[PDB]
């Protein structure tokens, strides 16, 4: 039944699965390899999900990498094949959903390889079923979110929840600390003010260089502040052009654009996806196939290594598209800095344009809706009413995404979080969902709708 | 690359010119909303751990 | 689509998940629970 109460419950079940997920998926302990890789991989994956190792929610967005890449390549060659490639944008997304269960699952495991698999013993059994159940429930709900069941806030919401949750856990965990303050509050050593306050009060200000002492903790806070000031500036900015709206006859509503903002969602998505693609392929190439020269198989298969850091490949395209492993405290490499900004930017803009086609917002889709309510025919124009918003949709979309992918790379440089991925993508999602939640709801407010 | 670049700059100047910023009233409203959003999520994951931790050995009670 | 008529007629989908939660208690050291 249609009814807002039914919709909130469907979100609530999905959310409950996430909460349920927070125990389970890990393997926990025994032996084997299920547990989570490195720097990029965790953000997608979402939260704390078996204590330190976050195994669960990774596959859904992983399928979304397949969606973007091909669509902008826009194959024409081979006649029967281009039609299949065009269809692929939707049809592949389901095939991709199959590939991620089939093939991503080895990639999800591999990074925290704990001690070798095939160790054996009866021990696990319940773990073998729980992983199988996880595959069944999350995959079923993912299908239901793309074709009829949700509310506002499906897939994005877990990322939205995850960032806030991650910040408290990093703040409130073991690592290096001399002594607790003697108030551990609701768990460990919570907000950073408590951590500073240990002995007596104060002493943060004393240090080397007016940073060093409490710099890893400090760096995390500033990361948020840098994003905080700039994010709101562009969210506030609006494109007008609704002009004459409401059929003519007098009573009217101005219509806000989706425009630059709708194109913004593919770029923010891009920074997450692009990094994924290189690492999975780099892992695949070594495992699958022998290897003369490093460079010969591929660039980014160039110098596949455990390297200095979790950031495996020390050479190739993948190297540039990861931080220099100091988060901008060394930028006097150059080759690395130059490639990182430019490469991401052009790839993002390409993906902004593919959002237009049949996967998101284009002028033709808008046009039919406008007639139904009668929008004033976009002040006529004849062949207009379609030219108005149509000409300004590729220009707005291409630009719309373009800025942000540069800014994301610069955010790492300015003063990244300790994970250096996980807060950064996730914060961008957290603002976004508030807009989706209430404006779509039509029930004019901003108040409750949690279970209402 | 020369033809795309001219278009991107031309679009950008119009967009900046368009609005200005979150026009004072808006500036407060969005900023507060983000802070509340961080807090609600932050609160609830944090609360559970209080009960869970001192079961094995009492360190703060729960 | 799906061969079953309605995917979530009954709470049961949750109950599969519940059996999944139950396991945590011995296998996974969430609570400081035993390590094999």
UniProtKB/Swiss-Prot annotation, chain A:
Residues 23-56, 108-124, 173-217, 283-332, 414-419 are lumenal. It comes from the Eukaryota. Keywords: Developmental protein, Endoplasmic reticulum, Membrane, Protein transport, Translocation, Transmembrane, Transmembrane helix, Transport. The chain crosses the membrane at residues 5-22, 57-73, 86-107, 125-143, 154-172, 218-235, 262-282, 333-355, 397-413, 420-434. It is found in: Endoplasmic reticulum membrane. This is Protein transport protein Sec61 subunit alpha isoform 1. It is a multi-pass membrane protein. Residues 74-85, 144-153, 236-261, 356-396, 435-452 are cytoplasmic. One of its GO terms (molecular function) is ribosome binding. Component of SEC61 channel-forming translocon complex that mediates transport of signal peptide-containing precursor polypeptides across the endoplasmic reticulum (ER). Forms a ribosome receptor and a gated pore in the ER membrane, both functions required for cotranslational translocation of nascent polypeptides. May cooperate with auxiliary protein SEC62, SEC63 and HSPA5/BiP to enable post-translational transport of small presecretory proteins. Its main location: endoplasmic reticulum. Belongs to the SecY/SEC61-alpha family. Pfam families: Plug_translocon, SecY. GO terms for cellular component: endoplasmic reticulum membrane; Sec61 translocon complex. PROSITE patterns: SECY_1 (PS00755), SECY_2 (PS00756). InterPro entries: SecY/SEC61-alpha, SecY_CS, SecY_dom_sf, Translocon_Sec61/SecY_plug_dom. SUPFAM superfamilies: Preprotein translocase SecY subunit. One of its GO terms (biological process) is SRP-dependent cotranslational protein targeting to membrane, translocation. It comes from Canis lupus familiaris (Dog). The SEC61 channel-forming translocon complex consists of channel-forming core components SEC61A1, SEC61B and SEC61G and different auxiliary components such as SEC62 and SEC63. The SEC61 channel associates with the multi-pass translocon (MPT) complex.
Curated annotation (Swiss-Prot), chain B:
InterPro entries: Prot_translocase_SecE_dom_sf, Translocase_Sec61-g, Translocase_SecE/Sec61-g. The keyword Disulfide bond does not apply. Residues 1-29 are cytoplasmic. PROSITE patterns: SECE_SEC61G. It is found in: Endoplasmic reticulum membrane. Pfam families: SecE (PF00584). One of its GO terms (cellular component) is Ssh1 translocon complex. The keyword Membrane applies. It is a single-pass membrane protein. Component of SEC61 channel-forming translocon complex that mediates transport of signal peptide-containing precursor polypeptides across the endoplasmic reticulum (ER). Forms a ribosome receptor and a gated pore in the ER membrane, both functions required for cotranslational translocation of nascent polypeptides. This is Protein transport protein Sec61 subunit gamma. The lineage of its organism: Eukaryota, Metazoa, Chordata, Craniata, Vertebrata.
